[PDB]
């Protein structure tokens, strides 16, 4: 009762009743999702402050399911104009900051009423605020063209420019002694897209193995880099979980799954006449944590090691001077300010365990925390729109790839399926189904790569000039010979500029 006077006087009455409106929305959401039990039926519904569950993940999951899962299937169609949608998501970010402030005030209000289940862990919600601030500022950057003398970079992003320049099979002006082979350009593009879509430093990119890439138990579309950390990288209190995600993009040239599958194709096979690859691995004597946890995601000097840092420094410098982009050191080497959230073991065991929350009507892992990843972090760091939140945006599939073209590349997975597929280690068949998903994405995105860059070293093999390969190529690329704009999408803002073929070809420097 000592803290009540400076808790009332800390706010305006207007701000106090606005905050009470917002946490009343929160407590109504907690009652309609059975997080806190209702006291009775058809009476004065009232919860005590002593047992009101408040946490970072509960506040953020409320924020998801109410504020940023703005689907509204009866009134979705009022976001066509950029001015009205800009006003609407500016209202979204203002209400986001105000609801986070209100629930911070509610967590402060429950502590004086002796609530042990009210700890905010405010750096998580500040990371969420910084995340949506970054996205709304990117939309502020596209909606404002006259900020400075950089209107080209207002239009053009770094990721699309560097990606489409690194899909170029010829390097007559890129580099002479740095980017000779196309496999080295593909592993550079793997490193650049694992930098862009996964905001890590260089050392977490060095930690990437084959066995550290899981699959989506909820999605099957996402590549789950479970950055497992127990008690030794710098940090004690062992369990610190940072989950990561790679989604297939709309454009087949900025997709991390397509680029990863292409470099793994040129790594396992390569060119039979020019550069024989590293070969397909054993996957038979795999201990759970030996073989796939000793092989990196890209080769370097030796065949089973990670490359050198200043080589990638020179690669970044030569690509950004070829693409005319201002390089800075911390924005591509050091740790980013806005990263995926790294959980602790206590909340990761208490919250995501579905058997300890059987009273809840709807588990968080089911819809709003897919693959134990926060939703908005996933669909912002994978460059999507998190506001429709349950649609089929990436599932738009004309001319799907057949199984006959699937069983003609990477036949080793078919051999293991005709081997004892269950008797192997868990990481082995997990990596096999990982390569199945990557091969399906690669086979889906292959006709656009053949149509726009036919001279790439995937096609240094005369089995690709057969009837079925070129027939599927023509069947998927028949609808692009007369259209002025492209068919597939690029980015959530950049589909009204660089969807036109003229600007998309002027992205290129050699052979526009």
């Amino acid at each position: 009762e000592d803290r009540f006077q400076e808790l009332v006087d800390s706010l305006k009455p207007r701000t106090a009743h606005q905050y009470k409106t917002y946490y009343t929305k929160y407590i109504q959401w907690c009652q309609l999702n059975q997080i806190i039990p209702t006291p009775e039926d058809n009476s004065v519904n009232s919860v005590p402050y002593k047992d009101l569950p408040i946490s970072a993940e509960l506040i953020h999951w409320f924020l998801l399911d109410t504020l940023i899962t703005d689907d509204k299937p009866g009134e979705k169609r009022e976001e066509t104009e950029d001015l009205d949608e800009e006003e609407e998501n500016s209202f979204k970010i203002a209400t986001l900051k105000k609801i986070i402030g209100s629930l911070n005030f509610l967590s402060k209000l429950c502590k004086v009423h002796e609530n042990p289940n009210a700890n905010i862990d405010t750096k998580y919600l500040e990371s969420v605020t910084k995340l949506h601030t970054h996205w709304i500022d990117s939309q502020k950057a596209i909606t404002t063209n006259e900020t400075n003398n950089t209107n080209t970079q207002v239009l053009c992003p770094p990721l699309l420019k560097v990606s489409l320049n690194l899909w170029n099979p010829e390097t007559n002006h890129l580099s002479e002694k740095f980017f000779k082979t196309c496999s080295e350009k593909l592993r550079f593009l793997v490193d650049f897209q694992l930098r862009s879509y996964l905001n890590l430093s260089f050392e977490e990119r060095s930690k990437i193995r084959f066995g550290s890439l899981k699959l989506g138990k909820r999605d099957r579309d996402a590549i789950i880099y479970h950055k497992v950390t127990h008690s030794a990288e710098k940090k004690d209190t062992p369990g610190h979980h940072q989950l990561l995600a790679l989604l297939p993009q709309d454009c087949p040239f900025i997709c991390p799954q397509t680029t990863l599958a292409a470099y793994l194709y040129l790594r396992f096979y390569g060119i039979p006449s020019v550069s024989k690859g590293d070969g397909f691995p054993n996957l038979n004597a795999d201990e759970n944590g030996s073989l796939l946890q000793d092989i990196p995601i890209l080769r370097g000097k030796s065949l089973t090691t990670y490359p050198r840092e200043e080589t990638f420094s020179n690669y970044y410098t030569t690509v950004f001077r070829y693409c005319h982009l201002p390089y800075k050191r911390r924005e591509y080497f050091n740790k980013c300010n806005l990263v995926y959230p790294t959980w602790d073991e206590d909340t990761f065991r208490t919250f995501f365990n579905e058997e300890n929350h059987g009273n809840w009507l709807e588990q968080p892992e089911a819809f709003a925390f897919p693959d134990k990843i926060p939703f908005d972090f996933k669909k912002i760091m994978n460059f999507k729109s998190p506001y429709t939140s349950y649609s089929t945006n990436a599932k738009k599939d004309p001319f799907p790839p057949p199984k006959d073209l699937l069983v003609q590349i990477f036949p080793e997975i078919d051999e293991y399926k005709r081997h004892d597929y269950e008797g192997l280690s868990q990481n082995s068949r997990d990596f096999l189904d990982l390569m199945e998903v990557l091969r399906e994405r690669f086979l889906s995105n292959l006709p656009w790569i053949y149509k726009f860059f036919p001279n790439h070293d995937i096609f240094q093999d005369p089995i690709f000039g057969n009837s079925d390969f070129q027939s599927y190529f023509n069947d998927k690329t028949i609808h692009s010979k007369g259209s002025p704009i492209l068919s597939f999408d690029i980015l959530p803002g950049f589909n009204k500029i660089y969807k036109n073929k003229t600007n998309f070809y002027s992205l290129l420097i050699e052979r526009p």
Binding site: E1, F4, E6, L7, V8, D9, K12, P13, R14, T15, A16, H17, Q18, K20, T21, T24, K25, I27, Q28, Q31, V44, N45, S46, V47, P48, Y49, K50, L52, L109, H113
Partner: protein
């Protein structure tokens, strides 16, 4: 039931004192004051109707801005919307505004310009920041102002309306000042507030300042922020800036300055009021820490009231008294202090503080007038003090005899404050 006519037959002192304790609350559809909602275990939550569906569709988008604050418990809103037709025309409410304006804006506090229902009408907010009464200026001049200004021309002038940005959006600030420009209503307003919910100012503040020279009836200016207090009303060292400042011609006009809710007013080395060279009162409303040795206090200022503060230093008069009569602090506390409570000290109670006083047998009527000249050298011609809710004065509090009498200093909420000595 309640009889309206019998209440309006009894004379105006009793009606004043009824509408005094009726703070601003005319309605029965009022929110709970924010002390009961927090000193309670339970949290009152909502959870069907037939008539309110007609009210929440038509009446509610008119009052969306000022009443979306109360979306918790919408029984408070569907009860509100029957008051929203008839309460502004009530004879009790209009009689309250009559007896307020007859006492120069003392009874119910600060009518406010707003722009609702496309009109630029007035508004009255209670202490819970809920509107209850909205009048356009023709209707407000017609049946309350002209209803008591029968023939006396010193009461036709209505110069006590606050303007109060942070109530409303900066687009509505622009539209309100434009419609207030196209009418002759700048002499109508009485004071302005400021919001902002590294010298950067908001858009609604710049719009308010650029039309503030045209007021010619502006007093009682007030701010609410700290990062805005340090910019537009504090001196801050700068003395020559044409744009973004608060236009020195209107600095001369104002009577007083209210400082609403901050942490410190002397965040820098000095909370200097060198300008605003014509203000009389200064009310520190909820500032956490103020030092009286860091305020520079103009040539003619009289009142420094200060409520709801958390820490006060003092004007450190005790550091200058002990150099005058040249003793130690421990000898002063036990030797020169008399603690007399004869009859006028016991009038206003102060049962928790202990009002003290210097001797007469140990000071020979010289270096008593010097010990009093120390106190008047520290106060510099102020009279009214008014310590409300306070805590933990660092230096001990020193008041002169010429100002302690006639209740010109007035400590009100005495729990942690103690030991005021009067010299």
């Amino acid at each position: 039931s309640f009889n309206p006519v019998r209440f309006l037959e009894l004379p105006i002192d009793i009606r004043k004192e009824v509408y005094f304790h009726l703070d601003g609350n005319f309605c029965g559809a009022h929110p709970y004051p924010i002390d009961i909602l927090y000193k309670s275990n339970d949290v009152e939550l909502p959870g069907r109707s037939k008539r309110s569906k007609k009210l929440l569709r038509y009446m509610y988008p008119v009052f969306a801005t000022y009443l979306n604050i109360f979306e918790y418990s919408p029984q408070l809103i569907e009860k509100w919307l029957e008051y929203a037709f008839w309460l502004r025309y009530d004879c009790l409410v209009l009689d309250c505004f009559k007896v307020n304006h007859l006492y120069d804006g003392t009874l119910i506090d600060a009518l406010e310009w707003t722009y609702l229902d496309n009109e630029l009408r007035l508004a009255y907010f209670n202490k819970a920041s809920m509107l209850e009464v909205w009048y356009t200026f023709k209707e407000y001049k017609k049946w309350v102002i002209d209803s008591v200004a029968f023939d006396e021309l010193d009461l036709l002038n209505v110069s006590n309306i606050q303007f109060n940005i942070d109530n409303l959006t900066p687009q509505l600030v622009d539209k309100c000042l434009s419609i207030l420009e196209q009418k002759d209503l700048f002499a109508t307003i009485g004071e302005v507030q400021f919001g902002q919910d590294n010298q950067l100012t908001s858009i609604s503040v710049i719009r308010t300042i650029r039309s503030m020279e045209s007021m010619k009836s502006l007093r009682k200016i007030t701010v609410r922020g700290e990062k805005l207090y340090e910019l537009l009303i504090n001196f801050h060292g700068f003395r020559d800036n044409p744009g973004k400042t608060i236009s020195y011609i209107v600095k001369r006009r104002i009577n007083e300055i209210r400082l609403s809710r901050m942490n410190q007013i002397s965040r820098t080395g000095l909370a200097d009021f060198t300008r605003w060279d014509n203000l009389q009162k200064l009310v520190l409303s909820r500032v956490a820490y103020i030092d009286l040795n860091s305020i520079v206090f103009p040539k003619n200022f009289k009142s420094l009231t200060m409520k709801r503060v958390s820490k006060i230093k003092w004007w450190n008069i005790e550091e200058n008294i002990l150099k005058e009569l040249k003793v130690d602090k421990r000898t002063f506390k036990s030797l020169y202090i008399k603690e007399d409570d004869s009859k006028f000290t016991k009038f206003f109670n102060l049962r928790h503080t202990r009002i003290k006083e210097l001797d007469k047998s140990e000071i020979n009527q010289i270096t008593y007038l010097r010990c009093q000249a120390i106190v008047w050298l520290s106060f510099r011609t102020l009279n009214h003090i008014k310590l409300q809710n306070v805590s933990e004065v660092f230096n001990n509090i020193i008041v002169p005899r010429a100002l302690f009498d006639s209740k010109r200093v007035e400590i009100y909420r005495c729990e942690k404050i103690s030991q005021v000595l009067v010299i």
